Design a protein around this ligand. Sequence first.
Ligand SMILES: C[S@@+](CC[C@H](N)C(=O)[O-])C[C@H]1O[C@@H](n2cnc3c(N)ncnc32)[C@H](O)[C@@H]1O
Length: 249
Amino acid sequence: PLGSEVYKGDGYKVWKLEPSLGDPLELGRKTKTEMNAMTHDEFDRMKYDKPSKGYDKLRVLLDLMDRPRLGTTVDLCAGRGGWSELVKDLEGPKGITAVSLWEEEWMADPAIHRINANVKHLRPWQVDTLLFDGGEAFKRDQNLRKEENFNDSLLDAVDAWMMQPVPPRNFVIKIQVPYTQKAIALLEKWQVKTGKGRLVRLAGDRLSNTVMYFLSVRLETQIRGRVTTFVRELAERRKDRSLTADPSL
Ligand SMILES: C[S@@+](CC[C@H](N)C(=O)[O-])C[C@H]1O[C@@H](n2cnc3c(N)ncnc32)[C@H](O)[C@@H]1O
């Protein structure tokens, strides 16, 4: 009788990702290329109070993490502040520092301490909890290596926060483009560094992006093959939601 433990299953929260064979970089570029070619109708079919929608997403992710106590928290790329606001509701505003580039308007509690800075600039420091929600999708006319390099360059800024002597006990790190060699290598290094970490895909996320999150739950390894499975499955779902199945029936 597994009892209450059943309630911490993945259920409707995240995709099931078992590892599979393949090159994730090549599959990711292939489905991105097909997404850039999609017609207006195809793309639209496939693409579908609180300070933002980030509030509920972080609530899902923290529930997966078994509702940990957060303590001193840095929210990197806080934007409008949905994540920071959820941390405020959970534990008060005193432990949060929001970091973002504003000029996005802050839509969360103004008692929350804010630093108007480029997260690539700040020297890291020691926190109980690290949140990172940076990441940008590029437009369909951009060379693919542009988007990959830009988001790799953001994750490299997170790398200094993860690799410090006392790493964050809790972390929630958005991975905009998880199939680059640098993202996969960074996640493996963070798993070795912390002894923790699982890369998840939220259920209900838009098929029009490849966002995953790295969470400080019990270790789940073979990240490369799980990204491979994620990208292949994402590609098939994009196929099906973009057609327009002809009957034929
Ligand atoms: C998608 S928002 C995150 C939303 C937020 N977590 C919420 O719940 O509302 C990411 C924000 O990071 C900011 N950003 C992008 N690059 C940045 C950088 N290099 N340094 C600091 N902020 C950055 C953008 O302005 C954007 O508003």
